[PDB]
Amino acid sequence: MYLRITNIVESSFFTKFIIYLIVLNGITMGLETSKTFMQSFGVYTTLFNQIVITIFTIEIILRIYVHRISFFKDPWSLFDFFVVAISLVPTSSGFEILRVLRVLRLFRLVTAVPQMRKIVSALISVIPGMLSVIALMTLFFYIFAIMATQLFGERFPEWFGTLGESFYTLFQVMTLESWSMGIVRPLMEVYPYAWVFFIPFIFVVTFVMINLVVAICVDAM
Amino acid sequence: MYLRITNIVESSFFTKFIIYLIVLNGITMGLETSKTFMQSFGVYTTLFNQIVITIFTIEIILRIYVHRISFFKDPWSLFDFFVVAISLVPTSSGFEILRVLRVLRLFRLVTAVPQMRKIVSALISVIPGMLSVIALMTLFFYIFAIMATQLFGERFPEWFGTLGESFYTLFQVMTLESWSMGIVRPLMEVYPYAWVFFIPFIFVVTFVMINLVVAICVDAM
Amino acid sequence: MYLRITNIVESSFFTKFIIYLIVLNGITMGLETSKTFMQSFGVYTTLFNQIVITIFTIEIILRIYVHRISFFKDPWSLFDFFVVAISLVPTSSGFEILRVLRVLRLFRLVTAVPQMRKIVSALISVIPGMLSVIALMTLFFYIFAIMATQLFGERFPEWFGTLGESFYTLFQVMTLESWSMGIVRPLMEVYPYAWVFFIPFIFVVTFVMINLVVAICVDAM
Amino acid sequence: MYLRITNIVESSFFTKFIIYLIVLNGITMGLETSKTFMQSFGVYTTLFNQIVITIFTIEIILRIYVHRISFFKDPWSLFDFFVVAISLVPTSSGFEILRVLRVLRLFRLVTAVPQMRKIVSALISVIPGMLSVIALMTLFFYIFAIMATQLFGERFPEWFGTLGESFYTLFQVMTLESWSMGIVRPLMEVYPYAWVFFIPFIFVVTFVMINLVVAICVDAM
């Protein structure tokens, strides 16, 4: 029966059918959002969901047979696998994160549809040639975060009282959001030289970003 | 008479004249702004308005005869058409949106004048080679908008209570405006892990935009 | 005597002497800033100023003789001329703008010193191939500014009650500063669809900027 | 014994060992952050600190013998030298700045590890080809800082009362943070034309930065 199913799976109708449900369930997720719609077509949608997830487990099963080991070595199928598994976990139990994470299946539309795979693929290919810099940066944040925690955490618990607190704040300063009016001016009210810690941080972190950008452009060209 | 008129439309004086009015109506449009001016040269300008729209419906007609089917296949013509059309809709009735959209006619200066067309044409030519990414992103915003609405809309109605409110807020976060001080810090007051939903979102969204820019730059090369 | 002076001006000592005073007066301007220093070396500096400006008028005079018409056709000398003229205007009379504008002479250091001329020259060379786009943009702002003045100036006098008010605000939105929390969220409290006017504005204005950037990189390469 | 030691320093185990401690002291540095941890493994870590700095002064010495004059001519060596030196300065005395600067040792991980050196080296190599612009800009900030101080320092002490306060504020405006809502709008409440000093400043500063980026990108190509 292998080739029998292998012809169903490998078929056109099959994919088109799946890609059909994606956009269908996708639209349903947006309506499941409305408190009103839920009072009307409430159940209609709830059932439509259990249906799709079933149809999708069947599909993922068929695909594994038709691909055996190859499947669990294909990034795209792996995703499809993991994304459907989450959707499988009972509506209740544990936290509703999983209940929310289910919407991640709409990402199935990137997998199932070529071109999308193309862009995503092209974007990710760039990541590798950025890890050296990304690593440099994380070391940088780690070092400055530890320094900030012990330089301002005492009098500024909210923004630097912790290593993670400091990580968050330093990240914020990097995006340049409210860094002066929101964090450094207030800080200088107690530590007049805090600017000696942040301006440099801003320069180094900005310079890198600039370079990083350059890299991608020049390397792609 | 075809060739008779066709020689008027195709004439220099014709274009130069139309371009003359554009800049004139254009200038008079900025005075129509002054509460004071409107108390003096008020009517002068009002009449001058009906005059220009007249002359312009004339011009648009002639052009259609001299071009027939070709006119309604010319992007620039079409624009000129739809922009003068609006300007035609009666001063009253419905809403004043239309009454405001009239100023869109000053865009005719991009049409009537070469060079401007080159830039607009050059800018737009790039759009098509961005649709794969723009689609990817929209999908992304859609998925995260749904998640956010069901994760923070209960306690944060203003920013996430709705799918559309969430779209707006997520766009704001993308432009990085007030994302930390104004949205995420407050959010973490109730949801300590909210940073796990927004930092990644900021990374993905930022990465893409970076790439997209590379593309505009690389492809032009 | 021409060649006599033409040998003084054209000399090395001459330039080095001028470039010397620049950095000298430059440092003096930074001290003239201190309320304290002004209570001590107050006059010392005030005289040192009248001296330099004199020495500089002499210099600019010599240069004109040694160059005649060529002078008033050299951008760099013209600047030097205009910048010294302002410094000439009496300390009193009119407004102190001129009194402040005097500090513009420190820009003499860009003129007098090569390399600086080089960079400035290279930066400005780019401007020309940006005017088409810059023009497009100014038209854009003009049109949207007029629209905003008549769409929100009534209920938001501070930010849109005027054509110029609107120009300023729209510029702010372009730099993306407080555009949502600061201007559009508040605006939507009265005009729920204001986002339909600003998001597009943000996209168009951002797209252009992105392109503009690309241009310079690609054209320079 | 030269070659005897020279074979230890030059050995793999030597480097791997040093790199081992870096990551160890590194990890222990993030725990030294926890108020709690310090109440438990408090001393454990404290002693482990004196141990590492010891081992490191040893390592730095050996290296100097095996390299002599070459050591104090190696940027990376020098860094390792000056970073361990600080870490040597007694826990007490003077200020704890030094006590905090100790964490800078984790930067040794950039030194001791190749690849990291490549990036840092690659990033820095670009700096030199930016000094002409960086000089131009600094001149610019200096001139505008002086002007601003004498134009708004009287009524706006916090942001412009001083040459240095002005430097800080102008830098903030350059990063575009809160420049309108937080600085210029308030300013215009007393000085209606302040927009004539800041928009141009924003244009010049933005233009340059754009170019500077082009340079990093173009030159790498």
Helix (H), strand (E), coil (C) string for A114-139: CCHHHHHHHHHHHHHHHHHHHHHHHH
How many Cα atoms are found within 13 Å in the side-chain-facing hemisphere of D56?
Answer: 28
Contacts of A147 in chain D (CB under 8 A): 100, 103
CB contact under 8 A, A175 and B202: yes
- Note whether C197 and C148 are within 8 A (CB): yes
Contacts for A161 with CB less than 8 Å, ≥ 6 apart: A149, A153, A154
What is the spatial distance between Cα A87 and Cα A104, in angstroms, rounded to a whole number?
A: 9
Which phi-psi region, left, alpha or beta, contains residue B136 (left: φ > 0; alpha: ψ -120 to 50)?
Answer: alpha
Of residues B133, B149, B176, nearest to A33 (C-beta):
B149
Nearest-Cα distance to chain A for B73, in Å, is 30
Q: Is B119 on the interface with C (CB under 8 A)?
A: yes
- Taking contacts as CB-CB distances below 8 angstroms, the residues of chain B near C150 are 33, 100
Overall number of domains in chain C: 2
Dist CA D145 CA D21 (whole Å):
47
- Measure in Å the smallest separation between the Cα of C70 and chain D Cα atoms: 27
Given a contact cutoff of 8 angstroms between Cβ atoms, the answer to whether B59 and B5 are in contact is no
Cα–Cα nearest to D110, from D101, D98, D122, D100: D122
d(CA C150, CA C144): 10
The shortest C-alpha distance from B153 to chain A (Å) reads 10
The vertex-B143 CA angle with A107 and A89, nearest 5°, equals 70
**Apex CA B51: angle with CA B49 and CA B54, to 5°?**
110
Residues B9 and B85 occupy one common structural domain: yes
Handedness of CA D205, D208, D214, D217 (dihedral sign): negative
CB spacing of D180 vs C176 below 8 angstroms: no
**Which residues of D belong to the annotated binding site for sn-glycerol 3-phosphate?**
30, 34, 162-164
Residue A49 to residue C170: CA distance in whole angstroms: 45
Question: Which residue, A114, A143, A172, sits at the end of a domain?
Answer: A114
CB contact under 8 A, A163 and D33: yes
Exposed e or buried b for every residue in D131-170, given b needs 16+ CB within 10 A? ebbebbbebbbbbbbbbbbbbbbeebeebbbbbebbbbbb
B221 in reach of chain C (CB within 8 A): yes
Query: Resolution in A, one decimal?
Result: 2.7
Residue D81 buriedness (CB in 10 A; 0-12 / 13-18 / 19+): middle
| Residue B173 distance to chain A (closest CA, Å) | 11
Of A175, A176, A220, nearest to B218 by CB-CB distance is A220
For chain B, the chains sharing at least 3 beta-carbon pairs closer than 8 angstroms are A, C
Flag whether A34 is marked binding.
Answer: yes
With a CB-CB cutoff of 8 Å, which residues 58-117 of chain B face chain C? 100, 103-104, 106-107, 109-110, 115-116
- Same structural domain for residues C67 and C158? no
- Cα atoms in the 13 Å half-sphere on the side-chain side of D84: 22
Q: Does A169 touch chain D (CB under 8 A)?
A: no
- Report the residue of chain B nearest C135, measured CA to CA: B116
D181 & D92 share domain: no
Interface residue B160 vs chain A (CB under 8 A):
no
Contacts of C210 in chain B (CB under 8 A): 213, 216
Q: Do the annotations mark residue C42 as ligand-binding?
A: no
CA-to-CA dists, residue C154 to B40, C132, C150, C157, D116, angstroms: 20, 34, 7, 6, 59
Residues D91 and D138 in one domain: no
Q: Are residues A109 and A128 in the same domain?
A: no
Chain A residues close to B213, C-beta within 8 Å: 213, 217
Cα distance between residue D13 and residue B163, in whole Å: 59
Q: Between helices D75-88 and D42-67, what is the axis angle to 10°?
A: 140
Question: Is residue A140 within 8 Å of D106, Cβ to Cβ?
Answer: no
* Chain B CB within 8 Å of residue A38 CB: no
Helices C195-220 and C163-174, interaxial angle, to 10°?
A: 60
What residues in A contact B180, CB-CB < 8 Å?
A: 168, 172, 175, 177-178
Place of tokens 């590890």: D113
Question: Same domain, yes or no, for B219 and B122?
Answer: yes
Do D1 and D104 have their domain in common?
yes
In chain B, alpha helices (H): 2-9, 12-31, 37-40, 42-67, 75-88, 97-101, 108-111, 116-126, 131-152, 157-160, 163-174, 185-188, 195-220
Which H or E element spans position C60?
A: helix C42-67
The shortest CB-CB distance from A100 to any of B147, B176, B208 is to B147
User: Are both A71 and A150 inside the same structural domain?
Assistant: no
Torsion of CA B203, B206, B207, B210, to 10 degrees: -160
C-alpha span between C77 and C71 (Å, rounded): 6
Do residues A87 and A53 touch, judged by C-beta distance below 8 A?
yes
Give the tokens for residue C206: 């951002």
CA distance A184 to A173: 9
Distance CA B148, CA B2 (A): 62
Question: CATH number of the domain that D6 lies in?
Answer: 1.20.120.350
Q: Is C12 annotated as a binding residue?
A: no
Q: Are residues B127 and B155 in the same domain?
A: yes
Q: How far is D214 from chain C (nearest CA, A)?
A: 5
Q: List the single residue in B with minimal CA-CA distance to C221.
A: B221
Both C105 and C186 in a single domain? no
Residues C100 and C135 in one domain: no
What letter would DSSP give residue D179?
A: I
User: Which residue, of B114, B136, B167, is where some domain finishes?
Assistant: B114
CA distance A52 to A49: 5
CB distance B181–A178 less than 8 Å? yes
* Cβ neighbours of D100 in A, within 8 Å: 147, 150-151
Which residue type, as a one-letter code, is found at position A46?
Answer: T
Across the interface, do D216 and A214 touch by the CB < 8 Å criterion? yes
Picking from B66, B95, B114, the residue at the C-terminal end of a domain is B114
Measured distance CA(A137)–CA(C69) in Å, rounded: 57
Is D29 in Cβ contact with A195 (below 8 Å)? no
Contact (CB<8Å) A133/D120: no
String of b and e for B152-178 (b: at least 16 CB within 10 Å)?
A: bbeebeebbbbbebbbbbbbbbbbbbb
Category of D114 on φ-ψ map: left (φ > 0), alpha (ψ -120 to 50) or beta: beta
Kind and range of the H or E element at A43?
helix A42-67
Q: Which of B180, B208, B213 sits opposite A177 (nearest CB)?
A: B180
Contact D150, C101 (CB under 8 A): no
Virtual CA dihedral for D134, D137, D142, D148, nearest 10 degrees? -150
* Nearest CA distance, C125 vs chain B (angstrom): 19
**B146 — contact with chain A (CB < 8 Å)?**
yes
Cα–Cα distance, A181 to A189 (Å, whole number) = 12
Looking at the complex, report in whole angstroms how far the Cα of residue D129 sits from the nearest Cα belonging to chain C: 11
Residue among C116, C118, C177 minimizing CB distance to D181 = C177
Across the interface, do C139 and B178 touch by the CB < 8 Å criterion? no
Q: Which chains touch A (3 or more CB pairs under 8 A)?
A: B, D
Long-range residue pairs from D42-49, CB within 8 A, at least 24 positions apart, any chain:
D49/D25
- Both B9 and B61 in a single domain? yes
Say whether C34 and D132 touch across the interface (CB within 8 A).
no
In the three-class reduction of DSSP (H, G, I as helix; E, B as strand; rest coil), residue B189 is classed as coil
CB contact (8 A) between residue C33 and residue D163: yes
Distance separating alpha carbons of residues C176 and B171, to the nearest angstrom: 12
Facing A33 at nearest CB: one of B163, B179, B218 = B163
Looking at the complex, does the CB of residue C176 fall below 8 Å from at least one CB of chain D? yes
CATH classification of the domain holding C167: 1.10.287.70
The domain of C189 spans 115-221
Q: How far apart are CA A183 and CA D175, in angstroms?
A: 14
